[PDB]
């Protein structure tokens, strides 16, 4: 409603926010920052083994 | 929907947006400042004479 979501900012965030990252729910503006966990490298057969 | 409409603004406007100074449709922020004719001192008799 503002508008200024993203021209020229770097909307920086927690893994929380991101959640299942599949599902985008199209209204974060393109250019958003978070910090996941390792979920693409770490599988689990390999968390299992840990 | 920005919301940013006065808080420290000061917009200045014509006398057309100012319309009938009687109504005000409530979507004017406050402070607006606008040039209009003198209504007031310039009477309909001083008008007629002139």
């Given at each position: ?12 965030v ?37």
């Amino acid at each position: 409603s503002v508008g200024l979501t993203g021209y020229g900012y770097t909307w920086i965030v927690p893994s929380l926010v991101a959640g299942d990252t599949d599902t985008v729910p199209a209204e974060f503006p393109t250019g958003l920052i978070s910090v996941s966990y390792d979920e693409w490298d770490y599988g689990l057969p390999a968390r299992v083994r840990d």
